Paper text:
We solved the crystal structure of ParcuCDPS at a resolution of 1.90 Å (9 residues out of the total 230 were not traceable), uncovering unique characteristics of histidine substrate selection. The structure was solved by iodide SAD phasing after extensive failed trials of molecular replacement, suggesting substantial deviation from previously determined CDPS structures. Additionally, we hypothesised D58 was acting as a potential active site residue, within hydrogen bond distance from the catalytic serine (S26), which could be important for S26 to act as a nucleophile. ParcuCDPS structure diverges from the common fold in helix α3 and beta-strand β3, where these regions change direction. β3 holds another important deviation seen in ParcuCDPS’ structure, as it changes direction (compared to common CDPS fold) at I56 to divide the active site pocket. This structural change of β3 facilitates the placement of D58 into H-bonding distance of the active site S26. P1 (shown in blue in Fig. 4c) is found deeper within the enzyme and is smaller and more restricted in size than P2 which sits at the solvent-accessible edge of the CDPS. From these calculations, P1 is predicted to be mostly neutral apart from Tyr55 and Glu174 which form a negatively charged microenvironment, while P2 is predicted to be mostly lined by positively charged residues.
Cyclodipeptide synthases (CDPSs) use aminoacylated tRNA (aa-tRNA) substrates to form peptide bonds between two amino acids yielding a cyclic dipeptide product (CDP). ParaCDPS from Parabacteroides sp. 20_3 (GenBank: EFK64745.1) produces cyclo(His-Phe)8 whilst ParcuCDPS from Parcubacteria bacterium RAAC4_OD1_1 (GenBank: ETB63777.1) can synthesise both cyclo(His-Glu) and cyclo(His-Pro)9. ParcuCDPS displays a Rossman-fold common throughout the CDPS family.
Numbering used by the authors: 1 to 60, 70 to 230
Write the structure that this text describes.
Amino acid sequence: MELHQIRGCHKNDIELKKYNIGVAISLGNKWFSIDNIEKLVKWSLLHTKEYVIIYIADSIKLSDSHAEEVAIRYGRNLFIKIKERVSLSFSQDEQAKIIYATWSDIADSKYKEKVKYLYNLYDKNINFKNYIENFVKEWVSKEKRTFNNNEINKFGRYILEELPELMVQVKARGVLFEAYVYPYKTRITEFVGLLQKGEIFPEIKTNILDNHPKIFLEVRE
């Protein structure tokens, strides 16, 4: 498990341990075994400025929020398994560095304003809508299962709920994490890169981004 590639800072910034580090779990993504999650947490604990923040980054009716429904249906059980593994593999003083951040811990008033900006843009701007929708379609085209165009549209909205967390530096339980680790570059991480640079949908950068962009750390075996 090692750093393969870096967006948002230089390699030295990491070795100087400048930043707190989030571990961004894609729940239901088959790479995110408990074993692989534990190895990302191990790596992040050895490179972090202080804290490691574990959270659910994406999900690819008991709540109005899809991320919240995923948090209560599946995220809580995942977090319990992770904690158990951690308490058996790490020392007490290492365990004190780890923060388990639920959707609620991240989606505060300021965060939700950003999501709401994106929802309104999804509704008023048909170029944005179609870009997000074609976005869902390409990933589903890699799946055997099929989806109707109303499901495609609903999945797009779900992406918008997590987009600010990938784009901007947010706090979990009061702790800023400037960087996050993820094992591979994806179409979503490339999209966020352009968004942060104002090279796609520049209105988004104007309206919800803050000149402190989320650093992406590509970490895999």
